[PDB]
Design a protein around this ligand. Structure first.
Ligand SMILES: [Cl-]
Length: 142
């Protein structure tokens, strides 16, 4: 019987280029009328000491269920969600609000995956990715 002298291997460390945070990876808009808009926001926060270049992009078009009685999920042919701004430079210790709108065109339950891509301005190779998801349903008022 003896004390262990072993350790878990640790081949990688998270560098300072990963110090950019979003607080919620999911927003669910309230139930929104077709053709009306609903509004929410997320924030990017740069906890590092460098200026960070960032850009948001959707990973695929919105996917929508409950459009008809088929039991199929469809892809929307339009941008049901919009983010503003979609790119920028975020200074050290800065917080950027991203305003997000949901503008359905018809009954359905909508969602979409997005990511934020960022890196320190001076080190474009030191990339960091943040996933978020958007969702909301559209029901007509009776
Ligand atoms: Cl997807």
């Amino acid at each position: 019987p003896h004390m262990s002298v072993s350790h878990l291997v640790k081949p990688m460390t998270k560098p300072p280029s990963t110090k950019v945070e979003i607080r919620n990876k999911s927003i669910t808009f309230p139930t929104t009328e077709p053709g009306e808009t609903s509004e929410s926001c997320l924030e990017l926060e740069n906890h590092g000491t460098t200026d960070v270049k960032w850009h948001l992009s959707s990973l695929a078009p919105p996917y929508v269920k409950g459009v008809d009685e088929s039991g199929d999920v469809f892809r929307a042919t339009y941008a049901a969600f919009r983010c503003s701004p979609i790119s920028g430079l975020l200074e050290s210790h800065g917080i950027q609000k991203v305003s997000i709108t949901f503008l359905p065109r018809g009954r359905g339950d909508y969602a979409q995956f997005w990511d934020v891509e960022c890196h320190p301005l001076k080190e474009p190779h030191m990339k960091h990715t943040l996933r978020f998801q958007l969702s909301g349903q559209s029901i007509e008022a009776e």
